Design a protein around this ligand. Structure first.
Ligand SMILES: O=C1c2cc(-c3nc(NC4CCOCC4)ncc3Cl)ccc2CN1CCN1CCOCC1
Length: 342
C-alpha cells in the first residue's frame, strides 16, 4: 500500500530503493535530492531530469550519460544507477543516482579559509580528473567551484557534464561576440573574441580562475555581463601583445582590442600577496591570454607547485576515448537500459 514521494512541486518516482528525500537544488529541466539507498546502505544523490520536450536538453542529457557511464575515475562523479519507466511511452523523467558528497568548493569558499596545503591538494585533484577527461577527447566546458564536490576528508570529484563536448579544435573559430552557454566568470578571453570553446585550453582557463578563487575566496573575473568579462580579464592580464593580437584574425575582434586604452599587467603577487610563489607561477601559466601558449593539463600536473603529489603512473588516462528530440529520447532509453531489471 505504497506511493511515490513528493519534494517541492515535483514527483520523485525512485522507490523502493530510494527513500527519505531532502531537496538539494534545481534548474531549467530538473531537480536534485538526496535519498537512502537500500541495496548498498548509504544515502546517495539523485537527479530527476525532464528533457524530453526540448532538442538541446535531450542532447545534453544524453552526452552527460554517455560520458559518465564511459568514465571511471576517483576524481570524477560516476553514475551508480539510473531509474526510468520500462517503456519509452511511460518514460517522462530519468533519475540519475550518484555518490552523495558533503559539500562543494563554492560553499567551502564562501565559508572557509583554505590553507596552502588544501589549495595544492584540491588543485592536484582537479587536474588529475581533468587529465582523464581530456585524455578521452572530452571537454567539461563548465568547470567552476559549484561543480567541484567534496567529502569530509577533502576528496574531490568533478560533476555536471551537462555542457561537455567531444573536443573539436579544427572547428573552434567563430565571430566576435558569439553567444556562449558556460558560466560567465570562468569563460576564457577567446570565447568573447573568436572561440566556440571546443579546445582543451578552455578548461584550463576555468581551472586558472578556480585557483585564483581558492587563493582569495573571491572570483577573480566577476564580470556582470558578456563583454564586461573580457574587461575584467584584460584589467588583470593587461593589453594583449602584438603576437597575441595577430592570432586574432577576425577584424571585428582585433579592432575591438585595438580600440581599448593600453593596460599593464597587474602582478599576481599584488592580488595574492600571501600566496605560494610556485602557485602564482602555475596560475600565470593557466591564465595566459593566448590559448595556444596556455599550459596543458599534464604539463600543469608536472609543475613544481604540485611536486608533493605528482605521480604520472597514478594519474590514469581513459581506456576508451570518444537528431530530433524523439530520436534522442530513444537514445536516452537505449543508453539507460542496462540499469533496468532484466
Ligand atoms: O547535477 C548537478 C549537480 C549535482 C551535485 C551533487 N551534489 C552533491 N552534494 C551536495 C553538494 C553541495 O552541498 C550539498 C550536497 N552530491 C552529489 C551530486 Cl551529483 C552538485 C551540483 C550539481 C550541478 N548539477 C547540474 C545542474 N542542475 C542542478 C539542479 O538540478 C538540475 C541540474
Amino acid at each position: 500500500g505504497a506511493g511515490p514521494e513528493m519534494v517541492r512541486g515535483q514527483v520523485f518516482d525512485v522507490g523502493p530503493r530510494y527513500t527519505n528525500l531532502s531537496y538539494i537544488g534545481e534548474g531549467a529541466y530538473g531537480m536534485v535530492c538526496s535519498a537512502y539507498d537500500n541495496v548498498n546502505k548509504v544515502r546517495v544523490a539523485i537527479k530527476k531530469i525532464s528533457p524530453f520536450e526540448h532538442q538541446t536538453y535531450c542532447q545534453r542529457t544524453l552526452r552527460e550519460i554517455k560520458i559518465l557511464l564511459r568514465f571511471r575515475h576517483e576524481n570524477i562523479i560516476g553514475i551508480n544507477d539510473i531509474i526510468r519507466a520500462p517503456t519509452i511511452e511511460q518514460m517522462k523523467d530519468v533519475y540519475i543516482v550518484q555518490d552523495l558528497m558533503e559539500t562543494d568548493l563554492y560553499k567551502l569558499l564562501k565559508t572557509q579559509h583554505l590553507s596552502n596545503d588544501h589549495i595544492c591538494y584540491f588543485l592536484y585533484q582537479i587536474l588529475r580528473g581533468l587529465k582523464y577527461i581530456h585524455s578521452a577527447n572530452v571537454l567539461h566546458r563548465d568547470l567552476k567551484p559549484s561543480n567541484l564536490l567534496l567529502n569530509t576528508t577533502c576528496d574531490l570529484k568533478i560533476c555536471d557534464f551537462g555542457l561537455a563536448r567531444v573536443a573539436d579544435p579544427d572547428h573552434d573559430h567563430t565571430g566576435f561576440l558569439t553567444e556562449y552557454v558556460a558560466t560567465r566568470w570562468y569563460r576564457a578571453p577567446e570565447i568573447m573574441l573568436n572561440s566556440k570553446g571546443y579546445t582543451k585550453s578552455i578548461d584550463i582557463w576555468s581551472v586558472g580562475c578556480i585557483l585564483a578563487e581558492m587563493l582569495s575566496n573571491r572570483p577573480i573575473f566577476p564580470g556582470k555581463h558578456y563583454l564586461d568579462q573580457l574587461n575584467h580579464i584584460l584589467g588583470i592580464l593587461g593589453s594583449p601583445s602584438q603576437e597575441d593580437l595577430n592570432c586574432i584574425i577576425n577584424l571585428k575582434a582585433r579592432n575591438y582590442l585595438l580600440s581599448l586604452p593600453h593596460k599593464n599587467k597587474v602582478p599576481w603577487n599584488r592580488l595574492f600577496p600571501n600566496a605560494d610563489s610556485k602557485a602564482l607561477d602555475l596560475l600565470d601559466k593557466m591564465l595566459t591570454f593566448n590559448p595556444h601558449k596556455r599550459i596543458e593539463v599534464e604539463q600543469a600536473l608536472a609543475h613544481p607547485y604540485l611536486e608533493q603529489y605528482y605521480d604520472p603512473s597514478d594519474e590514469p588516462i581513459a581506456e576508451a576515448p570518444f537528431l530530433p528530440k524523439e530520436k534522442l529520447k530513444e537514445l536516452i532509453f537505449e543508453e539507460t537500459a542496462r540499469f533496468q531489471p532484466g
